[PDB]
Design a protein around this ligand. Structure first.
Ligand SMILES: C[NH+](C)c1cc(NC(=O)CNC(C)(C)C)c(O)c2c1C[C@H]1C[C@H]3[C@H]([NH+](C)C)C(O)=C(C(N)=O)C(=O)[C@@]3(O)C(O)=C1C2=O
Ligand SMILES: [K+]
Ligand SMILES: [K+]
Ligand SMILES: [K+]
Ligand SMILES: [K+]
Ligand SMILES: [K+]
Ligand SMILES: [K+]
Ligand SMILES: [K+]
Ligand SMILES: [K+]
Ligand SMILES: [K+]
Ligand SMILES: [K+]
Ligand SMILES: [K+]
Ligand SMILES: [Mg+2]
Ligand SMILES: [Mg+2]
Ligand SMILES: [Mg+2]
Ligand SMILES: [Mg+2]
Ligand SMILES: [Mg+2]
Ligand SMILES: [Mg+2]
Ligand SMILES: [Mg+2]
Ligand SMILES: [Mg+2]
Ligand SMILES: [Mg+2]
Ligand SMILES: [Mg+2]
Ligand SMILES: [Mg+2]
Ligand SMILES: [Mg+2]
Ligand SMILES: [Mg+2]
Ligand SMILES: [Mg+2]
Ligand SMILES: [Mg+2]
Ligand SMILES: [Mg+2]
Ligand SMILES: [Mg+2]
Ligand SMILES: [Mg+2]
Ligand SMILES: [Mg+2]
Ligand SMILES: [Mg+2]
Ligand SMILES: [Mg+2]
Ligand SMILES: [Mg+2]
Ligand SMILES: [Mg+2]
Ligand SMILES: [Mg+2]
Ligand SMILES: [Mg+2]
Ligand SMILES: [Mg+2]
Ligand SMILES: [Mg+2]
Ligand SMILES: [Mg+2]
Ligand SMILES: [Mg+2]
Ligand SMILES: [Mg+2]
Ligand SMILES: [Mg+2]
Ligand SMILES: [Mg+2]
Ligand SMILES: [Mg+2]
Ligand SMILES: [Mg+2]
Ligand SMILES: [Mg+2]
Ligand SMILES: [Mg+2]
Ligand SMILES: [Mg+2]
Ligand SMILES: [Mg+2]
Ligand SMILES: [Mg+2]
Ligand SMILES: [Mg+2]
Ligand SMILES: [Mg+2]
Ligand SMILES: [Mg+2]
Ligand SMILES: [Mg+2]
Lengths: 150, 122, 116
RNA sequence: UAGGGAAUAGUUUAAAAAACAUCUGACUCACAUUCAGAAGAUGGAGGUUCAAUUCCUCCUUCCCUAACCA
RNA sequence: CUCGGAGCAGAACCCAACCUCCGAGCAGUACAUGCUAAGACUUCACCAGUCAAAGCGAACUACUAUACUCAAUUGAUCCAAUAACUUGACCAACGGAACAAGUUACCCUAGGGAUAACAGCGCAAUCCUAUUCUAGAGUCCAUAUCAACAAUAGGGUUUACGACCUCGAUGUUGGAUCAGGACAUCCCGAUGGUGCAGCCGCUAUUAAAGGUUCGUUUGUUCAACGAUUAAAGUCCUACGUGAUCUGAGUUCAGACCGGAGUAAUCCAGGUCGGUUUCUAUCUACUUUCAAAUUCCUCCCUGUACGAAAGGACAAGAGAAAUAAGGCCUACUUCACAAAGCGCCUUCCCCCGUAAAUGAUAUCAUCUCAACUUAGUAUACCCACACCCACCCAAGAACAGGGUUUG
RNA sequence: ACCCUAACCGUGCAAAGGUAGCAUAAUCACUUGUUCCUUAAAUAGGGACCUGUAUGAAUGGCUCCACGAGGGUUCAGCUGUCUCUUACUUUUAACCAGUGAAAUUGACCUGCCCGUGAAGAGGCGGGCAUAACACAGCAAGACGAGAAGACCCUAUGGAGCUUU
RNA sequence: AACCCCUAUACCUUCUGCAUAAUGAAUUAACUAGAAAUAACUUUGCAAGGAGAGCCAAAGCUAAGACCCCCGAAACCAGACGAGCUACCUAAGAACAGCUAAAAGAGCACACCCGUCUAUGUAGCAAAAUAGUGGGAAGAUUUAUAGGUAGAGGCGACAAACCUACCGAGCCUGGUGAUAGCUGGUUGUCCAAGAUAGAAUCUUAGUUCAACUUUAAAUUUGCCCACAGAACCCUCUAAAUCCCCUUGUAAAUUUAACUGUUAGUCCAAAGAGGAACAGCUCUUUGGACACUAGGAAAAAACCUUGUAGAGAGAGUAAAAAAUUUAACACCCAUAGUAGGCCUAAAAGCAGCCACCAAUUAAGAAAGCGUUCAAGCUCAACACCCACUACCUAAAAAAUCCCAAACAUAU
RNA sequence: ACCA
């Protein structure tokens, strides 16, 4: 948050730009054990806090009397420094991003899609899939998002 | 947790295109299935091992005939990844007491009631 | 090498109570059969179903177990439940799940014992 | 690192008192002693209890012990 | 350390953790909280625990009643007390031995790699490196240098963590000896940048052929200090190497001081003393290999370069040291000889870049364009008796040389 | 009483409140204190000072003659301890002749490199090497040999010792 | 055709798992290890009785068959035997040169006694030695002889010393085949069924019950599963489950009788702890392994695959790693004006506000710049097409790279 | 008073 704030506030035009947080402040406690301790002896003590973020979420939102080109530069800098894959997007680039994914799902010439096979348990494939894979449809592997997967 | 799987019923709703590829008649469904196990039950959960035994499919590549009815289809749906299902075809009708001893189940799924082991004269 | 701490959470070692339905829909019960055990009222007694002092639902007659959804009307002496319904918006009716036993046999028959 | 104990007037000890310090006066030529008055605290926060100086739980704080065998 | 409730464990039941939370070891009302009896539940066994129609007695006309509220609110058998009814454990290590603590380095046996200490392995939080980002510092200037917040990738040197091989033994910290390897380069070579005038620096690219001191101190690794040095590199090799050595340390039995304990004893707190076995069966290896490195002086030159102060470089010439390889004339230890402290000899390369010409892209452009430049061994060994014996600068034996000294 | 320390002041507590001495070390948080000697250089040794987590008076305290195969420091000399080894003698050795043990040993037709694997391979995978057999050396490996690990843990296994 | 070719990780034990560099084993011969009741079962006899007094009998009862190892501690106790060693003591002996000093537990130094340090030796010469160097050597000395003290003990200038070569308590015999929840052993052939929820426990290296597993018996459903049905508090509104006729199937329960298994690994999935480490630890649902075969290089746990023999037939399963990357416009620039304000000064470019006009066109200015200046680009004009693809950007360890190779025939 |  310190990196996001100082970089955005230092790089924005306060007269013609505003910025709002789209994530809450750290609220999830994270415990750590004393250095050098062995396994066991009860859970460790609360150390710091974090905010969970899922793929497809807006982290920070900007607007004002600017175009996308004006903010895309330093929004990409802050995004590149985030602990996950992130990207500066616009009201328009976000929509075309979603139209392109739906266009690919429609013109896909492969008769075999992850979803079709996994929903019908074809090949008994669910013996290697998570229950979550019925809705993730092969686009998610842990915390990673794969925009190429259809 | 790995569990038994519910298959959406849409999976078993054939489309007009499917009838063209495979050549079934939705208005005149076949009576009997030909079912062949083509895949091991090793490395499969026990409940699939059990249904393969109920269907008489313990030996691979060994055609069993079964009724094309909802109860049997319920079992065949659980092990549909272990098996090949084909319709039984009776180009010459059912065997009769006369020709019970002359049938052959051909690879095309047709049960012929006359098996001469001779070349077709024409 | 390092001295370690200790967990401050004691207790929590009781095992499951093994409570729940003992007789599902359509099952044949004899009088006395415990139909379901519970700690709170998930299922309420209906026709020919008694309740023990631990909220145990049991069969009072011999027959078939049914579960239904019925309108719930508390006893006017049950202050807490009556306080609930009095605050409900007009037109709102509470429902609970009830279990019943449909008796299978008649109470008896009239048979000829003498011709005197 | 891990356990235990302890925070009461400005001070030091009690179970909300006492002696000091302070304040007011008296005595003295003056000061001190002395005499007579007066104020002055339950570490903070969080509770319960009919009522919290012995009770919480936490914080803050200081201490005590232990930290061994290869 | 027993018992309940909640989560983990979302929906029949069940479900672990030195997991996350919260509770109980009672109170209160009764005095039919009397008797009896179908059918059932059940804490995964058992024991124990639970619910209940009908009936008998009661009670009885408006939630109560043949089974009180309440979640746990609890303890078997034996035995004891009692006329009988009935009563008795924080038996809390809570399925409960009727009643028993310490200490052992004076120790012993049985086992265990089911389990720790060494090493290996896993892992990489911690450590270390690189890159990405542009805040910031650097007078100005983000990028000569140095860097916050972060981000990504790597390494396997630390401290841990895990407990997978070895407890019918994988003994040893530091040192000696001999060193194999990495390159993340300390020095020597070649480059690029510079807040590079020069002399020195700083930073990066390339380079592992060659090298990388002696002392005082501590058992020491570490460090400090004295002298040097071109430089006194970082690491791995079972913290390389103990059937090669050492044993200061370390860590058994003896003893002392301080502390702890009633005492026996104990204390990664000090202190003094304390047995280091092995005849090599197998593998491996035993003249790779004759190309050499570095400093210094002179000189260039008080030149280049600088306002001065200062002050060099691919050359040129010497003289050394070390490392290899020999040798004995002299010296020295010695003496038909072997030696060093003495003497003699020692011979190529390396790539980072910097530049021409020049298209894709009619200029330019050193070019994962075609292209042109810097800029790619020799020496040694070598013929084959008898295989009597003798001799030898040859040699463990064998082999070799000589005998026209049998 | 600048700080340091407190002759001093207040209060409390105990049976008594550690006296005399002694203290950078058989003693040691900081610490290799500091200072004076000692060396070119000292985490050593000596003399002092600081002052005691936890020095201290027959559990003896503090000095001192003599003494000690005790532990430590040192002048001078001495020397192969070392720089840095060399030479010779005997022993051993090796060869001939005689006599003739031991531990050890699953079987062995018993290479190297990388990888793998019960996580460190002569024996597995992929490569590479490769006629056969004596003798002398060597000690890197054969987790070499020797002793059912003396460490550590476990066993309702022992034993010695001490006790409220 | 002996070898060359191809295939092939001794064995036993122990383990989650052993080619393991874990145990044991030179080899040969011989020796060397499952002992029995209760009940049940099977097969006879007799049968409301049986039995050759006793004891059983509501089909019993008699008889028979068939059944439960080996080696190993450290210890504990009883009674003997031990002081020719050694500890201490008693009686009665013996030795101690020379030199110095002269009171002598004085000095030097032999014999003699001891054992400091070094080396050697380590199945030795020796179950403690040898060589040198040492300490003492008229004394609390050393030593010959005989005798004494005895293991719950002695003796001790305490080292827990020594008491006949291992004394925290001797040795021998006996109790004694001590005991061992612990390790190691456990002997002919062939077939078959067979992998593990939990509870309690001075218990977690073990037991007992359950569970699973085996055998025999009885008689009847078992498994798979259709609707209908199983909660609110309040949803991560989960994958699922439970119940369950049909159906496909052949099991299931009960009765009798037992033992062994109750130290578990990886993989996928849902979680928990740890560091969203671990070949980590803990629950759960599956799978695999601890059982063959073929793949993934070797390879327990991934993929294919199961039922057994012979064949010099055949179809198949799983099964081989792909990828190559950063060029980029050319020109052109006058003017109100240094817009005011601010500021010592600000002139496009400190900061403040405003941002209009000139010429076809050039922002009261986007980036650099300075002395606030000046300068240098960019945005305009003119000429007139630069080619612009699409997103992109990495690497180092330690014995020695690692099959050989190959872009072309359906 | 306090054995189990
Ligand atoms: C950590 N502290 C508690 C401590 C520790 C040690 N030593 C050890 O812990 C040694 N530990 C081993 C045994 C090595 C494991 C210690 O040795 C000491 C001390 C405390 C100091 C106090 C010192 C203090 N001043 C001078 C700084 C002071 O005022 C006093 C006092 N009495 O008031 C001191 O005496 C003091 O100088 C001192 O002596 C201390 C220690 O000695
Ligand atoms: K071991
Ligand atoms: K030793
Ligand atoms: K000292
Ligand atoms: K000093
Ligand atoms: K001495
Ligand atoms: K060796
Ligand atoms: K191994
Ligand atoms: K092993
Ligand atoms: K072993
Ligand atoms: K064993
Ligand atoms: K046990
Ligand atoms: Mg001792
Ligand atoms: Mg032992
Ligand atoms: Mg292990
Ligand atoms: Mg380790
Ligand atoms: Mg190892
Ligand atoms: Mg390592
Ligand atoms: Mg484990
Ligand atoms: Mg061994
Ligand atoms: Mg080397
Ligand atoms: Mg080492
Ligand atoms: Mg010992
Ligand atoms: Mg003392
Ligand atoms: Mg003491
Ligand atoms: Mg000594
Ligand atoms: Mg020592
Ligand atoms: Mg040797
Ligand atoms: Mg004093
Ligand atoms: Mg001193
Ligand atoms: Mg100290
Ligand atoms: Mg001190
Ligand atoms: Mg004292
Ligand atoms: Mg005393
Ligand atoms: Mg004297
Ligand atoms: Mg003496
Ligand atoms: Mg001395
Ligand atoms: Mg000297
Ligand atoms: Mg070794
Ligand atoms: Mg060994
Ligand atoms: Mg052992
Ligand atoms: Mg015992
Ligand atoms: Mg005993
Ligand atoms: Mg193991
Ligand atoms: Mg072995
Ligand atoms: Mg073993
Ligand atoms: Mg052996
Ligand atoms: Mg006894
Ligand atoms: Mg003498
Ligand atoms: Mg004596
Ligand atoms: Mg003693
Ligand atoms: Mg002792
Ligand atoms: Mg003896
Ligand atoms: Mg035992
Ligand atoms: Mg594991």
């Amino acid at each position: 948050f310190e990196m996001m704030r100082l970089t955005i506030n230092r790089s924005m035009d306060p007269k013609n730009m505003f910025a709002i947080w789209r994530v809450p402040a750290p609220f999830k406690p994270i415990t750590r054990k004393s250095v050098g301790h062995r396994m066991g002896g009860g859970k460790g003590a609360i150390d710091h806090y974090v905010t969970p973020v899922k793929a497809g979420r807006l982290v920070v939102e900007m607007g004002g009397r600017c175009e996308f080109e004006e903010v895309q530069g330093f929004l990409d800098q802050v995004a590149h420094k985030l602990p996950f894959a992130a990207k500066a997007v616009s009201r328009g680039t976000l929509e075309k991003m979603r139209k392109d994914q739906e266009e690919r799902e429609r013109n896909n010439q492969n008769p075999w899609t992850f979803e079709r096979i996994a929903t019908a348990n074809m090949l008994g494939i669910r013996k290697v899939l998570s229950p979550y894979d019925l809705t993730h449809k092969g686009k998610y592997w842990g915390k990673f998002y794969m925009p190429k997967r259809v | 947790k790995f569990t038994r799987s519910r298959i959406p019923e849409k999976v078993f709703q054939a489309s007009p295109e499917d009838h063209e590829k495979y050549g079934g008649d939705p208005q005149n469904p076949h009576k009997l299935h030909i079912v062949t196990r083509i895949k091991s039950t090793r490395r499969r959960p026990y409940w699939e091992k059990d249904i393969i035994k109920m269907l008489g499919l313990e030996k691979a590549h060994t055609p069993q005939v079964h009724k094309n009815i909802p109860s049997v289809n319920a079992k065949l749906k659980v092990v549909k990844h272990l098996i090949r299902i084909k319709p039984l075809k009776l180009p010459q009708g059912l065997p009769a007491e006369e020709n019970m001893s002359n049938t052959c189940l051909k690879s095309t799924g047709e049960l012929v009631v006359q098996w001469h082991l001779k070349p077709v004269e024409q | 090498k390092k001295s370690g701490g200790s967990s401050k959470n004691l207790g929590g070692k009781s095992s499951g109570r093994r409570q729940g339905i003992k007789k599902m829909e359509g099952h044949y019960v004899h009088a006395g059969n415990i139909i379901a055990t519970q700690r709170h009222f998930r299922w309420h007694p209906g026709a020919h179903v008694g309740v023990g002092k631990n909220k145990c639902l049991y069969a009072l007659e011999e027959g078939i177990v049914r579960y239904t959804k019925e309108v719930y009307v508390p006893h006017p002496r049950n202050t807490e439940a009556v306080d609930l319904i009095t605050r409900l918006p007009k037109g709102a009716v509470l429902y609970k799940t009830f279990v019943h036993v449909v008796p299978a046999k008649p109470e008896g028959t009239f048979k000829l014992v003498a011709m005197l």
